[PDB]
Write a protein that binds this ligand. Structure first.
Ligand SMILES: [Ca+2]
Ligand SMILES: [Ca+2]
Ligand SMILES: [Ca+2]
Length: 212
């Protein structure tokens, strides 16, 4: 069997500090030992965001974390006898910051210029609007963006001219009518909303200039 790793849920509240796991060294009864820790987040920037009870070897986190700032922390423990002799070899402990969804997805832009041709046939791909999300796009949907249009303008010759692939944010003519003659440009309001379209959201525009 083996020892499992250590992950600590970001943005935690309750009271601080909090007990991660517990450290040891068989020189428990043989002498007196004092545990300490080295690394960033311990004895380096960020300064002591992690501490260990010298007499119990109880790891600790004296505040909340940001998986966007640092998702993983690497921490090293040491054992010393009351007299100043390392009894154990510096052991390494790894601490993972799980994620939570506190990031509004961000359209890479606010104004995505675009262009379509009159002929165009219902299916023609006109352009694409694109966004980013920094929450754990790898082990949570928390960075799963889902696109939709909010308001087209002018709404002629029909409400709902173009449409947008949710999954990839591409706009394609949805029905016919585009007539450069009377509606030369169009102003689409796209909306990216993470969590597969059930969480944080943002918006930007799309200017589809109909061509001859
Ligand atoms: Ca965060
Ligand atoms: Ca998010
Ligand atoms: Ca996050």
């Amino acid at each position: 069997w083996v020892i499992p790793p250590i992950s600590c849920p970001e943005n935690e509240k309750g009271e601080f500090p909090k007990n991660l796991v517990q450290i040891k060294s068989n020189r428990d009864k043989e002498t007196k030992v004092f545990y300490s820790i080295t690394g960033q987040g311990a004895d380096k920037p960020p300064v002591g965001v992690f501490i260990i009870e010298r007499e119990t070897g109880w790891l600790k986190v004296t505040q909340p974390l940001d998986r966007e700032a640092i998702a993983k922390y690497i921490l090293y423990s040491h054992a010393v006898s009351s007299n100043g002799e390392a009894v154990e070899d510096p052991m390494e402990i790894v601490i993972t910051v799980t994620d939570q969804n506190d990031n509004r997805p961000e359209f890479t832009q606010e104004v995505f210029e675009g262009s379509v041709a009159e002929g165009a046939v219902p299916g023609t791909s006109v352009m694409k609007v694109s966004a980013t999300d920094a929450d754990d796009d790898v082990n949570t949907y928390n960075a799963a963006i889902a696109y939709t249009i909010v308001s087209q303008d002018p709404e002629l010759p029909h409400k709902n001219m173009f449409t947008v692939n949710r999954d990839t944010g591409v706009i394609s003519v949805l029905t016919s009518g585009l007539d450069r003659e009377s509606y030369p440009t169009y102003t689409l309001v796209v909306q990216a909303a993470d969590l597969q379209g059930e969480g944080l959201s943002t918006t930007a525009k799309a200017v589809i200039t109909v061509k001859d």
